[PDB]
């Protein structure tokens, strides 16, 4: 009969880079 | 006979973090 | 005997959003 099923694979590749982050605060006054 | 194919492995990990956001808005008029 | 290795796992989730961006300008005089 067969033998054993093999391991599980190698994990998946890194996740792609997150979204660009919020605008930054205001400047200041004139 | 070898056995079948392991199971896909696990997630890859999460993704690093996106850009820093755009400047912000101009200050209030002086 | 074994049999070979199951493929790669699926890709990771998006990153975290990036960081605030830097101030803004001067307002007008």
Avoid: H, S, T
């Avoid at 009969?1 to 997150?18: N, V």
């Amino acid at each position: 009969p067969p033998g054993p099923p093999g391991p599980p694979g190698p994990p998946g590749e890194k996740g792609p880079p997150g979204p660009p982050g919020p605008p930054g605060p205001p400047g200041p006054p004139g």
